Design a protein around this motif. Structure first.
Motif, PDB file in Angstrom:
ATOM      1  N   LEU A 167       0.778  -1.150   0.069  1.00  0.00           N
ATOM      2  CA  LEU A 167       0.038   0.101  -0.043  1.00  0.00           C
ATOM      3  C   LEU A 167       0.822   1.380  -0.172  1.00  0.00           C
ATOM      4  N   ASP A 168       2.024   1.050   0.936  1.00  0.00           N
ATOM      5  CA  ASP A 168       2.639   2.505   0.760  1.00  0.00           C
ATOM      6  C   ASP A 168       3.440   2.737  -0.294  1.00  0.00           C
ATOM      7  N   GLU A 169       3.789   1.787  -1.053  1.00  0.00           N
ATOM      8  CA  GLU A 169       4.464   1.939  -2.523  1.00  0.00           C
ATOM      9  C   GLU A 169       3.621   2.205  -3.533  1.00  0.00           C
ATOM     10  N   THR A 170       2.203   1.790  -3.242  1.00  0.00           N
ATOM     11  CA  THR A 170       1.277   2.246  -4.053  1.00  0.00           C
ATOM     12  C   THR A 170       0.942   3.623  -4.043  1.00  0.00           C
ATOM     13  N   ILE A 171       0.690   4.257  -2.588  1.00  0.00           N
ATOM     14  CA  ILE A 171       0.672   5.537  -2.368  1.00  0.00           C
ATOM     15  C   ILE A 171       1.807   6.406  -3.004  1.00  0.00           C
ATOM     16  N   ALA A 172       3.239   5.924  -2.735  1.00  0.00           N
ATOM     17  CA  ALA A 172       4.102   6.651  -2.940  1.00  0.00           C
ATOM     18  C   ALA A 172       4.036   6.890  -4.744  1.00  0.00           C
ATOM     19  N   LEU A 173       4.023   5.785  -5.484  1.00  0.00           N
ATOM     20  CA  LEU A 173       3.883   6.018  -7.070  1.00  0.00           C
ATOM     21  C   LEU A 173       2.740   6.974  -7.434  1.00  0.00           C
ATOM     22  N   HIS A 174       1.768   6.959  -6.667  1.00  0.00           N
ATOM     23  CA  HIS A 174       0.603   8.069  -7.066  1.00  0.00           C
ATOM     24  C   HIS A 174       0.950   9.339  -6.283  1.00  0.00           C
ATOM     25  N   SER A 175       1.873   9.431  -5.582  1.00  0.00           N
ATOM     26  CA  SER A 175       2.321  10.987  -4.787  1.00  0.00           C
ATOM     27  C   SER A 175       3.638  11.342  -5.318  1.00  0.00           C
ATOM     28  N   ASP A 176       4.245  10.759  -6.175  1.00  0.00           N
ATOM     29  CA  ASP A 176       5.663  11.050  -6.547  1.00  0.00           C
ATOM     30  C   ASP A 176       5.852  12.015  -7.663  1.00  0.00           C
ATOM     31  N   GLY A 177       4.622  12.509  -8.301  1.00  0.00           N
ATOM     32  CA  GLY A 177       4.597  13.256  -9.234  1.00  0.00           C
ATOM     33  C   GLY A 177       4.462  12.797 -10.641  1.00  0.00           C
ATOM     34  N   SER A 178       4.741  11.306 -11.158  1.00  0.00           N
ATOM     35  CA  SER A 178       4.657  10.537 -12.022  1.00  0.00           C
ATOM     36  C   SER A 178       3.150  10.594 -12.826  1.00  0.00           C
ATOM     37  N   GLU A 179       2.205  10.881 -11.824  1.00  0.00           N
ATOM     38  CA  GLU A 179       0.651  11.024 -12.413  1.00  0.00           C
ATOM     39  C   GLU A 179       0.562  12.352 -13.537  1.00  0.00           C
ATOM     40  N   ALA A 180       1.495  13.188 -13.376  1.00  0.00           N
ATOM     41  CA  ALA A 180       1.428  14.538 -14.276  1.00  0.00           C
ATOM     42  C   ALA A 180       1.705  13.997 -15.678  1.00  0.00           C
ATOM     43  N   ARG A 181       2.539  12.780 -15.776  1.00  0.00           N
ATOM     44  CA  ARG A 181       3.221  12.147 -17.027  1.00  0.00           C
ATOM     45  C   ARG A 181       1.780  11.699 -17.968  1.00  0.00           C
ATOM     46  N   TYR A 182       0.889  11.318 -17.325  1.00  0.00           N
ATOM     47  CA  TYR A 182      -0.206  10.412 -17.822  1.00  0.00           C
ATOM     48  C   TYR A 182      -1.713  10.924 -17.788  1.00  0.00           C
ATOM     49  N   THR A 183      -2.243  11.025 -18.990  1.00  0.00           N
ATOM     50  CA  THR A 183      -3.620  11.554 -18.923  1.00  0.00           C
ATOM     51  C   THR A 183      -4.631  10.603 -18.274  1.00  0.00           C
ATOM     52  N   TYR A 184      -4.117   9.311 -18.564  1.00  0.00           N
ATOM     53  CA  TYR A 184      -5.233   7.902 -18.002  1.00  0.00           C
ATOM     54  C   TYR A 184      -4.463   7.480 -16.936  1.00  0.00           C
ATOM     55  N   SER A 185      -4.963   7.013 -16.066  1.00  0.00           N
ATOM     56  CA  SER A 185      -4.279   6.155 -14.608  1.00  0.00           C
ATOM     57  C   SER A 185      -5.358   5.418 -13.824  1.00  0.00           C
ATOM     58  N   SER A 186      -5.180   4.376 -13.904  1.00  0.00           N
ATOM     59  CA  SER A 186      -6.154   3.563 -12.685  1.00  0.00           C
ATOM     60  C   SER A 186      -5.064   2.161 -12.273  1.00  0.00           C
ATOM     61  N   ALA A 187      -5.615   1.557 -11.291  1.00  0.00           N
ATOM     62  CA  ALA A 187      -4.954   0.333 -10.764  1.00  0.00           C
ATOM     63  C   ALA A 187      -5.983  -0.475 -10.287  1.00  0.00           C
ATOM     64  N   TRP A 188      -5.841  -1.805 -10.394  1.00  0.00           N
ATOM     65  CA  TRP A 188      -6.406  -3.028  -9.501  1.00  0.00           C
ATOM     66  C   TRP A 188      -5.571  -3.141  -8.124  1.00  0.00           C
ATOM     67  N   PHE A 189      -6.187  -3.386  -7.009  1.00  0.00           N
ATOM     68  CA  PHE A 189      -5.274  -3.340  -5.887  1.00  0.00           C
ATOM     69  C   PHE A 189      -5.659  -4.381  -5.011  1.00  0.00           C
TER      70      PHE A 189
END
Ligand SMILES: Cc1cc2nc3c(=O)[nH]c(=O)nc-3n(C[C@H](O)[C@H](O)[C@H](O)COP(=O)(O)OP(=O)(O)OC[C@H]3O[C@@H](n4cnc5c(N)ncnc54)[C@H](O)[C@@H]3O)c2cc1C
Ligand SMILES: CCOc1ccc(CNc2nc3cc(C(F)(F)F)ccc3nc2C(=O)O)cc1
Ligand SMILES: C[C@H](CO)OC[C@@H](C)OC[C@@H](C)O
Length: 427
Positions: free
Chosen positions: A202-224
């Motif tokens: 979970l921590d690594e999932t949150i980190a991935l979404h909080s590290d700024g990389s979301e700005a590089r993609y117009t589309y984003s989702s995940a199964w968890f």
């Protein structure tokens, strides 16, 4: 016209209603007039394709107007990027019609089987919310049949903008959307370029979404994973991308860039090492839509927690996995900025949909989830709900009184009404 037993997609809380089903817009105008004539009574609600899990498109002992026969595409314009469509056209239909113009439906949910009316009324969101907002952000005008029998032309700004924004996310309770203009997104292909990542926790999932990389993609989702114990809890398969340009397509697909094509522990290792990838060209179906009628023994639950309440979000996930209620189908996304619709579901933050098999103790458990979501500044989504209370809902939506105020001005006699409206005291 025809008495029919109605449920949402969740196959719950059945109630019988008189269903009108006609392509004649004037029969719809007259049917509403009849309800206001001896009205309000039990009133009327519009209904699209019935994909909301809950009770917003049903009205026990009243009228339901099936809008799917009203399915004309009036015009599509590549220069202005505008489509003018009846509220009953569905997103699959619209997607297919608009592609040859190099145009893309600006917000696509997890099924293409929703009406334009349904998309507006629930102000739906998709994989691209963080970059595109929700469906309501892209409506340039709509024609609303109101309680008085008049068809109001609504726009996002200027006169009557308040009613426009009450109709977006309004769950059909301001009247019947007959027609709308949507601004589409330009595209040179029907394909996505996608990066895949797999996280261990979970921590690594949150980190991935909080590290700024979301700005590089117009589309984003995940199964968890909502079943494993920590730290495996909240590990995810993340899929992120953008629409492809023509030259990014394999040479073989380049001649027809805008065509939409026809539809254990070893399992984990494969899913994990091959779940990581870069620049994969995928059609709409593989990137988004693996694609009947939904099963009857499941409770759909979707909530968002504000971005800043991240510790609180982690706690709710912990609560879910330690509950003895198991969900395998789990969507996770970070929402972007909200819009100005008072009853709009999305706010910036951690969005989760879980699916629970109906077991003893589920109802009371999800009531405890409600409490937690509320406490932490979040809310649940009407399109997925059939069991929360008026109290919880009003508290989750701080602008509910503002919205009710608009609703009473446009519908004093309560000509428009549904099972949801009564349950959540929005009537
Ligand atoms: C498999 C699946 C995946 C989904 N994925 C997503 C997702 O990713 N994101 C998301 O946001 N949602 C999602 N949903 C929910 C779905 O997008 C909404 O429930 C949507 O509103 C359903 O559209 P519909 O035409 O079936 O409307 P219905 O369920 O028939 O109606 C829903 C509401 O729209 C109102 N309405 C419909 N037509 C009109 C009209 N012409 N005028 C006024 N009001 C009207 C109804 O009164 C009702 O309040 C999903 C649902 C399913 C079953
Ligand atoms: C076994 C049935 O097949 C399916 C069909 C569709 C899906 C994806 N469905 C969803 N995707 C969603 C995707 C998102 C998003 F936008 F990606 F975050 C939000 C809500 C979503 N809700 C659903 C739902 O089922 O209500 C998963 C499995
Ligand atoms: C509707 C909601 C209050 O529960 O407000 C959303 C806040 C958190 O976000 C602000 C928008 C502009 O991004």
């Amino acid at each position: 016209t025809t008495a029919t037993r109605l449920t949402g997609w969740g196959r719950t809380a059945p109630s019988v209603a008189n269903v009108l089903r006609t392509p004649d817009a004037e029969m719809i105008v007259k049917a509403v007039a009849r309800v206001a004539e001896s009205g309000g009574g039990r009133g009327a609600i519009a209904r699209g394709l019935g994909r909301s899990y809950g009770d917003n498109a049903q009205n026990g002992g009243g009228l339901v107007i099936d809008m799917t026969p009203l399915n004309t595409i009036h015009s599509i314009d590549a220069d202005t990027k505008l489509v003018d469509i009846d509220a009953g056209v569905n997103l699959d239909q619209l997607m297919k019609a608009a592609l040859p113009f190099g145009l893309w439906v600006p917000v696509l949910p997890g099924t293409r089987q929703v009406t334009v009316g349904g998309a507006i009324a629930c102000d739906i969101h998709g994989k691209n919310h963080h970059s595109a907002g929700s469906f309501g952000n892209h409506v340039r005008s709509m024609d609303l049949l109101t309680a008085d029998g008049e068809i109001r032309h609504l726009t996002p700004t200027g006169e009557d903008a308040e009613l426009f924004w009450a109709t977006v996310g309004g769950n059909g309770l301001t009247g019947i959307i007959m027609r709308a203009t949507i601004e589409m997104t330009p595209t040179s292909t029907a394909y996505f370029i996608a990066d895949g990542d797999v996280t261990a926790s979970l921590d690594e999932t949150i980190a991935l979404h909080s590290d700024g990389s979301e700005a590089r993609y117009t589309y984003s989702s995940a199964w968890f994973d909502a079943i494993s114990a920590p730290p495996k809890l909240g590990r995810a398969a993340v899929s992120r991308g953008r629409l492809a340009t023509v030259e990014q397509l394999p040479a073989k697909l380049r001649s027809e860039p805008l065509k939409f094509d026809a539809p254990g522990p070893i399992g984990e290792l494969w899913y994990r090492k091959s779940g990581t990838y870069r620049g994969k060209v995928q059609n709409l179906t593989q990137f988004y839509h693996p694609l009947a009628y939904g099963p009857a023994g499941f409770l759909q639950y979707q909530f968002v927690i504000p971005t800043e309440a991240v510790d609180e979000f982690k706690k709710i996930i912990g609560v879910i996995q330690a509950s003895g209620h198991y969900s395998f189908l789990n969507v996770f996304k970070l929402f972007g900025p909200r819009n100005q619709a008072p009853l709009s579901f999305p706010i910036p933050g951690w969005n989760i949909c879980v699916d629970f098999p109906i077991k003893d103790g589920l109802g009371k458990f999800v009531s405890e989830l409600d409490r937690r979501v509320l406490e932490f500044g979040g809310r649940l989504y009407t399109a997925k709900d059939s069991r929360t209370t008026a109290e919880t809902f009003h508290a989750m939506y701080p602008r509910v009184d503002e919205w009710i105020s608009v609703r009473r001005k446009v519908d004093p006699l309560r000509v428009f009404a549904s099972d949801m409206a009564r349950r959540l005291e929005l009537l």
